[PDB]
Scaffold this active site. Structure first.
Site, PDB file in Angstrom:
ATOM      1  N   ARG A  74       0.925  -1.193  -0.209  1.00 21.01           N
ATOM      2  CA  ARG A  74       0.155   0.073  -0.064  1.00 21.01           C
ATOM      3  C   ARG A  74       0.853   1.271   0.013  1.00 21.01           C
ATOM      4  O   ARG A  74       1.727   1.565   0.937  1.00 21.01           O
ATOM      5  CB  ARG A  74      -0.978  -0.056   1.259  1.00 21.01           C
ATOM      6  CG  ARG A  74      -2.102   0.987   1.082  1.00 21.01           C
ATOM      7  CD  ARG A  74      -2.776   1.097   2.516  1.00 21.01           C
ATOM      8  NE  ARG A  74      -4.041   2.046   2.150  1.00 21.01           N
ATOM      9  CZ  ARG A  74      -4.917   2.596   2.922  1.00 21.01           C
ATOM     10  NH1 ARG A  74      -4.665   2.246   4.320  1.00 21.01           N
ATOM     11  NH2 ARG A  74      -5.857   3.588   2.567  1.00 21.01           N
ATOM     12  N   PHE A  99       1.513  10.680   1.558  1.00 24.72           N
ATOM     13  CA  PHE A  99       1.184  10.243   2.722  1.00 24.72           C
ATOM     14  C   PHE A  99       2.282   9.152   3.371  1.00 24.72           C
ATOM     15  O   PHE A  99       3.096   9.711   4.303  1.00 24.72           O
ATOM     16  CB  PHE A  99      -0.012   9.613   2.834  1.00 24.72           C
ATOM     17  CG  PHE A  99      -0.661   9.271   4.056  1.00 24.72           C
ATOM     18  CD1 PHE A  99       0.013   9.247   5.246  1.00 24.72           C
ATOM     19  CD2 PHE A  99      -1.925   8.416   4.050  1.00 24.72           C
ATOM     20  CE1 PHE A  99      -0.535   8.634   6.404  1.00 24.72           C
ATOM     21  CE2 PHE A  99      -2.400   7.842   5.201  1.00 24.72           C
ATOM     22  CZ  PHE A  99      -1.687   8.091   6.213  1.00 24.72           C
ATOM     23  N   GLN A 103       3.669   1.501   2.985  1.00 26.20           N
ATOM     24  CA  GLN A 103       3.402   0.325   4.008  1.00 26.20           C
ATOM     25  C   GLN A 103       3.684  -1.099   3.461  1.00 26.20           C
ATOM     26  O   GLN A 103       3.489  -1.302   2.494  1.00 26.20           O
ATOM     27  CB  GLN A 103       1.786   0.613   4.450  1.00 26.20           C
ATOM     28  CG  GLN A 103       1.413  -0.610   5.424  1.00 26.20           C
ATOM     29  CD  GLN A 103      -0.071  -0.452   5.881  1.00 26.20           C
ATOM     30  OE1 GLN A 103      -0.579   0.424   5.266  1.00 26.20           O
ATOM     31  NE2 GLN A 103      -0.599  -1.547   6.410  1.00 26.20           N
ATOM     32  N   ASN A 128      -1.447  -0.827  12.095  1.00 23.39           N
ATOM     33  CA  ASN A 128      -2.390  -1.496  13.188  1.00 23.39           C
ATOM     34  C   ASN A 128      -4.095  -1.204  12.575  1.00 23.39           C
ATOM     35  O   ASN A 128      -4.198  -0.485  11.689  1.00 23.39           O
ATOM     36  CB  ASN A 128      -2.263  -0.905  14.515  1.00 23.39           C
ATOM     37  CG  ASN A 128      -2.871   0.547  14.962  1.00 23.39           C
ATOM     38  OD1 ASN A 128      -4.094   0.988  14.366  1.00 23.39           O
ATOM     39  ND2 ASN A 128      -2.106   1.215  15.761  1.00 23.39           N
ATOM     40  N   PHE A 138       4.867   1.399   8.332  1.00 21.62           N
ATOM     41  CA  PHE A 138       4.841   2.353   7.282  1.00 21.62           C
ATOM     42  C   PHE A 138       5.894   3.391   7.638  1.00 21.62           C
ATOM     43  O   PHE A 138       6.611   3.614   8.789  1.00 21.62           O
ATOM     44  CB  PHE A 138       3.552   2.901   7.172  1.00 21.62           C
ATOM     45  CG  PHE A 138       2.835   3.791   8.269  1.00 21.62           C
ATOM     46  CD1 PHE A 138       2.415   3.102   9.365  1.00 21.62           C
ATOM     47  CD2 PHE A 138       3.190   5.138   8.297  1.00 21.62           C
ATOM     48  CE1 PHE A 138       1.820   3.738  10.597  1.00 21.62           C
ATOM     49  CE2 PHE A 138       2.578   5.833   9.576  1.00 21.62           C
ATOM     50  CZ  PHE A 138       1.938   5.245  10.583  1.00 21.62           C
ATOM     51  N   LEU A 143      -1.935  10.754  12.821  1.00 16.06           N
ATOM     52  CA  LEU A 143      -1.827   9.351  13.472  1.00 16.06           C
ATOM     53  C   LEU A 143      -1.098   9.243  14.934  1.00 16.06           C
ATOM     54  O   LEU A 143      -0.808   8.410  15.553  1.00 16.06           O
ATOM     55  CB  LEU A 143      -1.048   8.471  12.654  1.00 16.06           C
ATOM     56  CG  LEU A 143      -1.668   8.134  11.206  1.00 16.06           C
ATOM     57  CD1 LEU A 143      -0.731   7.652  10.006  1.00 16.06           C
ATOM     58  CD2 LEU A 143      -2.818   7.875  11.280  1.00 16.06           C
ATOM     59  N   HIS A 174      -0.634   5.449  16.395  1.00 16.15           N
ATOM     60  CA  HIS A 174       0.366   4.503  15.877  1.00 16.15           C
ATOM     61  C   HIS A 174       1.505   4.603  16.501  1.00 16.15           C
ATOM     62  O   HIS A 174       2.127   5.814  16.745  1.00 16.15           O
ATOM     63  CB  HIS A 174       0.576   4.586  14.347  1.00 16.15           C
ATOM     64  CG  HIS A 174      -0.740   4.187  13.636  1.00 16.15           C
ATOM     65  ND1 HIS A 174      -0.969   3.169  12.946  1.00 16.15           N
ATOM     66  CD2 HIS A 174      -1.922   4.880  13.641  1.00 16.15           C
ATOM     67  CE1 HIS A 174      -1.959   3.099  12.611  1.00 16.15           C
ATOM     68  NE2 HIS A 174      -2.785   3.982  13.076  1.00 16.15           N
TER      69      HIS A 174
HETATM   70 ZN   LIG Z   1      -4.908   3.969  12.687  1.00 14.28          ZN
END
Ligand SMILES: [Zn+2]
Ligand SMILES: [Zn+2]
Length: 185
Positions: free
Chosen positions: A64, A69, A72, A111, A122, A131, A135
């Site tokens: 991904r 951004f 991942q 997660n 990521f 985040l 995370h």
């Molecule tokens: Zn999240």
């Protein structure tokens, strides 16, 4: 300014990833890891990079990728985001949220809600403050951010999956002789 009094995490160990897009070698990413701040989370990532438990990141993919951004990866069991496991079991708790997603290059656990860390992670390509507190941040890219950007800008489909597989051709641990602090940026 000398920033004497700013609080900073210390890099205690490194991991390298040699990356490929399709069959093209594209370079090395070196991640500094904060083993005093999040030892359990770092120890998992390092063991998965060495493969020493009999499973790990080598030849897994970045399944991904979202431009502006993050990229991942870490699903070495299913390669699709449904899998992966930690050295402590499928899931382990959020160790702490001491570190934030300060800017490009910060490395954090993927997660599916509270206390669901496994092996997926990521690498941010921008500040991802939304985040923070959700995370667990545990490293920062120190070398090869330009290689991360090659992955970031690879063509993807509407599910953010690279059209050509992006793989970790090789990976491992690099010892750090003397731990060193870095800026929260
Ligand atoms: Zn999240
Ligand atoms: Zn070819």
């Amino acid at each position: 300014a000398m920033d004497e009094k700013k609080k900073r995490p210390k890099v205690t160990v490194k991991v390298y990833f040699d990356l490929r897009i399709g069959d093209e070698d594209i370079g090395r990413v070196v991640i500094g890891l904060f083993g005093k701040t999040v030892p359990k989370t770092v120890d998992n990532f390092v063991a998965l990079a060495t493969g020493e438990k009999g499973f790990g990141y080598k030849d897994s993919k970045f399944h991904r990728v979202i431009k502006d951004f993050m990229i991942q990866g870490g699903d070495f069991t299913r390669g699709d985001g449904t899998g992966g496991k930690s050295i402590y079991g499928e899931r382990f708790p959020d160790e702490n949220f001491k570190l934030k997603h300060y800017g490009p290059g910060w490395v954090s656990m993927a997660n599916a809600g509270k206390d669901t860390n496994g092996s997926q992670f990521f690498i941010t390509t921008v500040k991802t403050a939304w985040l923070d507190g959700k995370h667990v941040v545990f490293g920062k890219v120190l070398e090869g951010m330009e290689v991360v950007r090659k992955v970031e800008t690879t063509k993807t489909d509407g599910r953010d999956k690279p059209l050509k597989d992006v793989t970790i051709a090789d990976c491992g641990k690099i010892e750090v002789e003397k731990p060193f602090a870095i800026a929260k940026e």
